Amino acid sequence: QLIAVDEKLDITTLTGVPEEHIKTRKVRIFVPARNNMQSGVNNTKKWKMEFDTRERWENPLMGWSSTADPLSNLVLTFSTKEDAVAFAEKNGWSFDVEERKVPKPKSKSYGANFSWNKRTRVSTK
Amino acid sequence: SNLIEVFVDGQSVMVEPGTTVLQACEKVGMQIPRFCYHERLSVAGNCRMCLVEIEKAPKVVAACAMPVMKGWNILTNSEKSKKAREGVMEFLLANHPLDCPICDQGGECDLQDQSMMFGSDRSRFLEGKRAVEDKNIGPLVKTIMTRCIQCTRCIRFASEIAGVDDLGTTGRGNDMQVGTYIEKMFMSELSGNIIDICPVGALTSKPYAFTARPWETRKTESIDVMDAVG
Amino acid sequence: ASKVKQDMPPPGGYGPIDYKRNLPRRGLS
Amino acid sequence: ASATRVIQLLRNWASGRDLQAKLQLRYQEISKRTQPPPKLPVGPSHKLSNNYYCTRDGRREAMPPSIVMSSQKTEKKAVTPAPPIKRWELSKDQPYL
Amino acid sequence: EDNKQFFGRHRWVIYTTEMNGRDTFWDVDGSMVPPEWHRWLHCMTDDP
Amino acid sequence: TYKFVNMREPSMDMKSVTDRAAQTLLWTELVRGLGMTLSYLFREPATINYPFEKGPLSPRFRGEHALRRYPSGEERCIACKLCEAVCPAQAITIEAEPRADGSRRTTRYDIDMTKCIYCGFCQEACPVDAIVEGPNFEFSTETHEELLYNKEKLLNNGDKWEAEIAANIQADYLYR
Amino acid sequence: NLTLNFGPGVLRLVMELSGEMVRKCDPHIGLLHRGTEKLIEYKTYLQALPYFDRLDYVSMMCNEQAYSLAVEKLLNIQPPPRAQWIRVLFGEITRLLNHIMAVTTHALDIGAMTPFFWMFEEREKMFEFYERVSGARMHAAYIRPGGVHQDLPLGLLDDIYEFSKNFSFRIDELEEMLTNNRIWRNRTVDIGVVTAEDALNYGFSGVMLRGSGIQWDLRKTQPYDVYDQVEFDVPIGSRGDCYDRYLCRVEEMRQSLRIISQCLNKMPPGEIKVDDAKVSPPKRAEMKTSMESLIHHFKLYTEGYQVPPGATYTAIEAPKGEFGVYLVSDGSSRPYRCKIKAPGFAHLAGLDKMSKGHMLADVVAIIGTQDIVFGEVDR
Amino acid sequence: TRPTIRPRNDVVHKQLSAFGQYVAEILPKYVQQVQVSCFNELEIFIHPDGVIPVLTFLRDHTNAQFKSLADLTAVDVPTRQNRFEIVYNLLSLRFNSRIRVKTYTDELTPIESSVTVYKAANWYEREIWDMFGVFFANHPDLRRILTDYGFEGHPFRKDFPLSGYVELRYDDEVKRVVAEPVELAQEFRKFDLNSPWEAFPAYRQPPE
Amino acid sequence: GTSVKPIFSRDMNEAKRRVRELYRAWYREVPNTVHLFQLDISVKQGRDKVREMFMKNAHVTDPRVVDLLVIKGKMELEETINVWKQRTHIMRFFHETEAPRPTDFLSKFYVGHDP
Amino acid sequence: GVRTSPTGEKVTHTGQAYDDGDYRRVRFSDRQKEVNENFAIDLIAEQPVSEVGSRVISCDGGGGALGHPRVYINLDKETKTGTCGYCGLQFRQPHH
Amino acid sequence: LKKTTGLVGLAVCETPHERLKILYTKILDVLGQIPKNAAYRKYTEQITNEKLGMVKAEPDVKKLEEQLQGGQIEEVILQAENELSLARKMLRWKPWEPLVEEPPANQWKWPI
Numbered sequence A: 001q002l003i004a005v006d007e008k009l010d011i012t013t014l015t016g017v018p019e020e021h022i023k024t025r026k027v028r029i030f031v032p033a034r035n036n037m038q039s040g041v042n043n044t045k046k047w048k049m050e051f052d053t054r055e056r057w058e059n060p061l062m063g064w065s066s067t068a069d070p071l072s073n074l075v076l077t078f079s080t081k082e083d084a085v086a087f088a089e090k091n092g093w094s095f096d097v098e099e100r101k102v103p104k105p106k107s108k109s110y111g112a113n114f115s116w117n118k119r120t121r122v123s124t125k
Numbered sequence B: 001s002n003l004i005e006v007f008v009d010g011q012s013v014m015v016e017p018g019t020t021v022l023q024a025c026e027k028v029g030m031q032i033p034r035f036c037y038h039e040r041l042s043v044a045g046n047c048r049m050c051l052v053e054i055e056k057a058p059k060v061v062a063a064c065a066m067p068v069m070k071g072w073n074i075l076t077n078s079e080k081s082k083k084a085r086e087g088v089m090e091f092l093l094a095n096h097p098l099d100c101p102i103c104d105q106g107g108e109c110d111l112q113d114q115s116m117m118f119g120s121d122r123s124r125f126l127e128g129k130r131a132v133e134d135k136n137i138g139p140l141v142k143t144i145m146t147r148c149i150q151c152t153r154c155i156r157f158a159s160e161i162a163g164v165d166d167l168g169t170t171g172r173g174n175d176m177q178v179g180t181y182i183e184k185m186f187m188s189e190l191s192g193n194i195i196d197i198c199p200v201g202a203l204t205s206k207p208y209a210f211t212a213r214p215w216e217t218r219k220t221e222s223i224d225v226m227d228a229v230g
Numbered sequence C: 001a002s003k004v005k006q007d008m009p010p011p012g013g014y015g016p017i018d019y020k021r022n023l024p025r026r027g028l029s
Numbered sequence D: 001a002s003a004t005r006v007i008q009l010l011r012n013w014a015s016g017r018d019l020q021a022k023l024q025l026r027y028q029e030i031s032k033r034t035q036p037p038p039k040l041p042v043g044p045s046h047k048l049s050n051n052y053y054c055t056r057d058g059r060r061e062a063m064p065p066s067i068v069m070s071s072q073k074t075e076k077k078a079v080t081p082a083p084p085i086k087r088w089e090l091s092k093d094q095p096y097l
Numbered sequence E: 001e002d003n004k005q006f007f008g009r010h011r012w013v014i015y016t017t018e019m020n021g022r023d024t025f026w027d028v029d030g031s032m033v034p035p036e037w038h039r040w041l042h043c044m045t046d047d048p
Numbered sequence F: 001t002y003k004f005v006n007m008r009e010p011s012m013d014m015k016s017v018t019d020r021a022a023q024t025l026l027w028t029e030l031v032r033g034l035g036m037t038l039s040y041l042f043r044e045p046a047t048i049n050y051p052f053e054k055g056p057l058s059p060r061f062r063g064e065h066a067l068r069r070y071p072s073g074e075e076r077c078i079a080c081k082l083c084e085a086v087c088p089a090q091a092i093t094i095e096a097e098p099r100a101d102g103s104r105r106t107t108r109y110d111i112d113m114t115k116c117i118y119c120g121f122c123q124e125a126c127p128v129d130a131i132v133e134g135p136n137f138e139f140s141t142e143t144h145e146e147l148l149y150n151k152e153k154l155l156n157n158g159d160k161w162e163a164e165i166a167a168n169i170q171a172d173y174l175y176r
Numbered sequence G: 001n002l003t004l005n006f007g008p009g010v011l012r013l014v015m016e017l018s019g020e021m022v023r024k025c026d027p028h029i030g031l032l033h034r035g036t037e038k039l040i041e042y043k044t045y046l047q048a049l050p051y052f053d054r055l056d057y058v059s060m061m062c063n064e065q066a067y068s069l070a071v072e073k074l075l076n077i078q079p080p081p082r083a084q085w086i087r088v089l090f091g092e093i094t095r096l097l098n099h100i101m102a103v104t105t106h107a108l109d110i111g112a113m114t115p116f117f118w119m120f121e122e123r124e125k126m127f128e129f130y131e132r133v134s135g136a137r138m139h140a141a142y143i144r145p146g147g148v149h150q151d152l153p154l155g156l157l158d159d160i161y162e163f164s165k166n167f168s169f170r171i172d173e174l175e176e177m178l179t180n181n182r183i184w185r186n187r188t189v190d191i192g193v194v195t196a197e198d199a200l201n202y203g204f205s206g207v208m209l210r211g212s213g214i215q216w217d218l219r220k221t222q223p224y225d226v227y228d229q230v231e232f233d234v235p236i237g238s239r240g241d242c243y244d245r246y247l248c249r250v251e252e253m254r255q256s257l258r259i260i261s262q263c264l265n266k267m268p269p270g271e272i273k274v275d276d277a278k279v280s281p282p283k284r285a286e287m288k289t290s291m292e293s294l295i296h297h298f299k300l301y302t303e304g305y306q307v308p309p310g311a312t313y314t315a316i317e318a319p320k321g322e323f324g325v326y327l328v329s330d331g332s333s334r335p336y337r338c339k340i341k342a343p344g345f346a347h348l349a350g351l352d353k354m355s356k357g358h359m360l361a362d363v364v365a366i367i368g369t370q371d372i373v374f375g376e377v378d379r
Numbered sequence H: 001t002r003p004t005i006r007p008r009n010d011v012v013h014k015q016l017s018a019f020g021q022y023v024a025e026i027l028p029k030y031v032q033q034v035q036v037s038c039f040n041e042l043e044i045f046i047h048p049d050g051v052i053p054v055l056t057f058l059r060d061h062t063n064a065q066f067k068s069l070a071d072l073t074a075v076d077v078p079t080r081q082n083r084f085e086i087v088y089n090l091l092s093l094r095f096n097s098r099i100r101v102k103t104y105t106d107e108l109t110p111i112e113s114s115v116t117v118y119k120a121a122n123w124y125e126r127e128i129w130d131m132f133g134v135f136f137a138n139h140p141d142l143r144r145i146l147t148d149y150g151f152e153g154h155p156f157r158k159d160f161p162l163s164g165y166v167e168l169r170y171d172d173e174v175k176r177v178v179a180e181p182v183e184l185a186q187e188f189r190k191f192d193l194n195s196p197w198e199a200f201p202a203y204r205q206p207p208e
Numbered sequence I: 001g002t003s004v005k006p007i008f009s010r011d012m013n014e015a016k017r018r019v020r021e022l023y024r025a026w027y028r029e030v031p032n033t034v035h036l037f038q039l040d041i042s043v044k045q046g047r048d049k050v051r052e053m054f055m056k057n058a059h060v061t062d063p064r065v066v067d068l069l070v071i072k073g074k075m076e077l078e079e080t081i082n083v084w085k086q087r088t089h090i091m092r093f094f095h096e097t098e099a100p101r102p103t104d105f106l107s108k109f110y111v112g113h114d115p
Numbered sequence J: 001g002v003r004t005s006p007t008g009e010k011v012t013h014t015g016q017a018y019d020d021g022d023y024r025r026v027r028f029s030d031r032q033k034e035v036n037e038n039f040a041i042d043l044i045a046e047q048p049v050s051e052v053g054s055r056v057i058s059c060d061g062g063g064g065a066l067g068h069p070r071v072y073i074n075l076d077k078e079t080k081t082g083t084c085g086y087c088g089l090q091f092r093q094p095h096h
Numbered sequence K: 001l002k003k004t005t006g007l008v009g010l011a012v013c014e015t016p017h018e019r020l021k022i023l024y025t026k027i028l029d030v031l032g033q034i035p036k037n038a039a040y041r042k043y044t045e046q047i048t049n050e051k052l053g054m055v056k057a058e059p060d061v062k063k064l065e066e067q068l069q070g071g072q073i074e075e076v077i078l079q080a081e082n083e084l085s086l087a088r089k090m091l092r093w094k095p096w097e098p099l100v101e102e103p104p105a106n107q108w109k110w111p112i
């Protein structure tokens, strides 16, 4: 009832993607960096897969922004790095993986503001 | 070792001595609301948005400044802490100007988002608001001080990171204002960063003014080449 | 001061509305 | 309707109904196209006190679904998903068309 | 206007024969009505 | 409660059978339908005399878009991009910069009228009543290009329709 | 055995006939597939609302209500009572519009074209009601997931009452044209008979069930809004053919008039959207006077409200049958998945069985009695 | 809870929980999980092998008799090893109840067709095959139902682009409609709307 | 391990048998398709197109992928034989309106930034 | 405040005009270029500065709820005048 | 005797007590071959025994329809036939056996 065939998964021939949008693309798998304008960290929880930026030009009428690559807006979400890597490999996309950046824990001390001899003593508050 | 045991919503977590309530909540994955606290700056404790209830304690404590004690059960989502958050947000919004459509920090405002997530949905403020005059600190940072919430992040950054002590507060009470008290440009190689640390549209980028909204922008993660720091 | 004014039915409600089928027999054996 | 009496009688006889009582063309019986201003009252949350949002927060009372019978972790009368539906009544207003 | 006609036929316009630059003796169209008479003619208001 | 639509049993007495036979042979119900049509011929038609007469409309009706301005003559739009954000069809394109006097104003405000669904979400998202959907609906065109409105076209539409637009807003704003 | 491809609402139909008999009927659809369900994933919930107007175009108000009910269930909120009463009133008006469209078209295809005009005058009046309440005649977007967008104008109830007290005569004229006509009965009686068991197994709903004698109606069995506060009867067929379904539809219109009367007499006062500014936008004056109202307006019109994670299947008793939405939220302000369930999909899938052993001209009658609108079927 | 909050119904919650436990007890071979949502909706997560039995049971058991198939659809979740989840919504008129049955599959594993249980499934599975590429074994005639003839790919997959890969126009040189790679005069504007500052603490995930 | 459920074929040999059967069916169908749709191509180049489409997938070594491709090809043949396709659908295999894309480095460098 | 480009085209309020060698000008031949003649910057520059004896003043653009959100403007700086961020009206304290 | 049960395709059943008794006896016979500890066997035997006892103690048809809570004794007969067919297919399927296999680690985790 089981084949037990040994080969890496490959579904490129079944997805209908054109040839030049498989081998020429370079996906990036990363945890998005926090927007520095805000302190909330809820946007840095999941992994993202996104494609490489292609040409954008000006529409001769209306001066709008025109594109020719169909994957310009494609972003996928993943729970772990391994899941995204597996998806990319089974879809035949060359990928670059960036390790997650976590802000290291810090030593905070309110009393250090009023130091007797150290430089941590603040001049205003 | 020296790790002590504390509880966040009844969940045990081991922390180093000197860890504050805010970092203890961070270790479990809960982010306490804040306006004046920054990881890279000295602790201020003035915005009172981080107030949280300790179990079997009648008074809420400031999570950003209070070191956690052994056996403490921090109740991040209790009714007392939620009411404290609503009251603090109401006070913060009482005198805030209705500038969201013209404010550059529209879709990137910690005030807006924390009002939507932790504050009330209406106002009962029937008075008139205060207005302060703007300050000129150069051609890089645009200043609209009516939007200022007096978190003092800019002052702490200028004094501690940039090494420049030209920023401060003048006056007392409701009319205390953040500025220089003299016409003077805050010009240093790190001056633009006070735009990022400011949670509101009080300090904005001047060359970037009115050009885009945050939800439109595509973010490309890249490297600077203006020097060899990378 | 001023009272509430929105679109409301008149006091006592509306008049009855016919809905039953009416297919009269003209009459001839 | 500006219809002659003879034509009204002829159309009434042809249709078999009295047309004048229920006309399909609108006339002065409709409302004026200029109306007084409204007032539009406010909802139940417009109070000045005892109105904390945490006590009327519907979205924050939603919870993840209750788990019964996770596989990874007595007489016993049989049960049905819901009680058998009661049969309908035969419309003692006009039971048959 | 004529209030004795049914709703829709109780207000009407007779178009001018010479608008800005064209002979509109035969070639009339709805866009020749100015906005105020447009509001009156479409029964958006009862006041001319 | 429920009702039966077709649960009647025909009578089988001689009189009823003869009545049904008379209907079958003399075509009675067809004559009834002819009478209904004849009665409809003699009543007043419901046709209106377009374009001399127009169909009724409401102050809430949404037509061609317009950009309004203040009574002083300065435009109301301050380039917040809320209408662009809410547009379900992505039919609005906005670009903005500080003006020569420092004002927050648009340099580009385009509406693709062939992508617009005329939902009116833009005019209700607007905080300053700058973009509205005005009463005009007779703006058909001979080419696709003239339906790609820029800021100049929308400002011209506002200056053209402001009287009626302001009257409609005065009529309907207490409901908003 | 000859094969004919009746190509291009818009429908392609490949049939094999043995003489006059229809041996096989195969509908090819997708001529109006616009990819609504994929497009919804790129919109906020408010931005996704107007697609439901275009799903089943004949009855726009009902789709709005179904979508709003699904979103409200996922949000754990409820609309105010006046909003619910307005929703039910306009749903019954919507039902009348759909029924007039279905009945007249069925008659027109059958070759009787007079009642199409007669009742499209009434359809125009109901379009006027739509436009006065929302500003649009047919693609309304009036019913929102917090209630309704705007309150009724000060003279709308009186005009609705004036319209509704004359409509029964129009239905009587339509019946005079149709119900006892021998040609109409010969065209409809004993055509497309479906058994109760087959109707249940094939996924039929609405009149397509009730024509076979199945006593089922979502407004009675699983009431939504205030349908448990109104009184009406559910017409039931006895032979499962086109004639019984036509009678059921005609009877349903009369019942809708009854419900509309009750809604008019019992319209309550109060607000029209939920008093929760994190879901429903505030009033314009509040937005221009209060800081919180302005912030909530900004956020609700830029990001939209977040819906807690979870999936629901919400169905309502639509004019064409059971209309449903399977909505999956991942916790953000954009739906993760929105599967639209259309009654016409299953009805057209059953057309093949329904047309077995009939004339070619009976296929038109069966398609007319299935009440098929292409936009909902293809999505 | 005040008028703005949806009221709860504990009676239906208890009934649905009891019936879920009942179903899980009767078919332990296939039922992997049973859940009831806070708005009283019952879902049963099963192994793919049990599609025909479980459905048959839910259709034919005297205490269940869910005789109506309201909807059958699929959901694409790329992060899962089994990419697609298959959802059956069933309605019981006898007990005025609804149930949901969930299973899973990947790109290559077929799922048993359920046309023998419900005729209504015939088109639904076809649509799934068109939109997600899930193959149904022993389907009477499986083929595309919604896309154009010769269309490549499955649009409802998450990785499928919104505008697709080809577009159509009329060419006068060949006097016919032709298909060419997509080129937009205005690119679709991607909006980043998700805010930081999480909204619902009750759905917070462990930080691992 | 790595045990998976079959679709139609247990090993590659059955898959190739199915592939050959589908190829025979397409080869037989080509002339009738050329005549019925009034195509201006020849039978030879139509069969060359069939061969090229088959050879595009020659690198597949997974029997499940192979018989899924066979299922899709059989669906395509079903569409062609029953004349559900139009002339445009058949002619889409040839890309007659697309200008050729050069492959060498210099041409790609000249036309733009796209590799 | 419409001006004229050296080529001959009207310069819009945004300051746009095709340069001399720009081919896109061909779109305006046998047709016209849509230009709004009412320049908002000039029109708002014509409004007189309001004289108010208050340190802080509120502006809503006029018309009540038909204006813009109400904002408060400080008039402590005597060198300049307070300007509304929505409407552009100017306010000033009575110096001397 | 009544006519026209009201459901298209559902014939009026004359003498329904005997048909119900035969169907319930056949159902119990089939259930006897299922293992004694299987939940389906015990539950279906309990339901069938209740229904058989209720049909044996009520000769009046309408009272039987009210007691059975299914109504229209013809569809009660139809549901009994469906239960018999399901019982045979379940004796074939053997769903009382332990679970075939667990799902992957995070197959059902939502969100993400």
Ligand code: SF4
Binding pocket: B096, B097, B098, B099, B100, B101, B103, B104, B105, B106, B107, B109, B110, B111, B112, B147, B199, B200, B201, B202, G295
């Ligand atoms: S700082 Fe934030 S809340 Fe204040 S006006 Fe700007 S966007 Fe609005």
Ligand code: SF4
Binding pocket: B147, B148, B149, B150, B151, B152, B153, B154, B155, B178, B197, B198, B199, B200, B202, B203
């Ligand atoms: S200007 Fe900004 S950073 Fe400085 S105190 Fe005010 S709100 Fe804080």
Ligand code: SF4
Binding pocket: F083, F086, F087, F088, F089, F090, F091, F092, F111, F115, F116, F117, F118, F119, F120, F121, F122, F123
């Ligand atoms: S009416 Fe709707 S679709 Fe049209 S521009 Fe406004 S928001 Fe966009």
Ligand code: SF4
Binding pocket: B101, F076, F077, F078, F079, F080, F081, F082, F083, F084, F094, F122, F125, F126, F127, F128, F129, F130, F131
């Ligand atoms: S038209 Fe209104 S909503 Fe749109 S950018 Fe201008 S001010 Fe903002």
Ligand code: FES
Binding pocket: B033, B034, B035, B036, B037, B044, B045, B046, B047, B048, B049, B050, B051, B062, B063, B064, B065
């Ligand atoms: S964040 Fe702690 S008081 Fe401000």
Ligand SMILES: [Mg+2]
Binding pocket: B105, B194, B195, B196, B197, B198, B199, B200, B201, B202, B203, B204
């Ligand atoms: Mg800032």
Ligand SMILES: [Zn+2]
Binding pocket: J059, J060, J061, J068, J084, J085, J086, J087, J088, J089
């Ligand atoms: Zn102003």
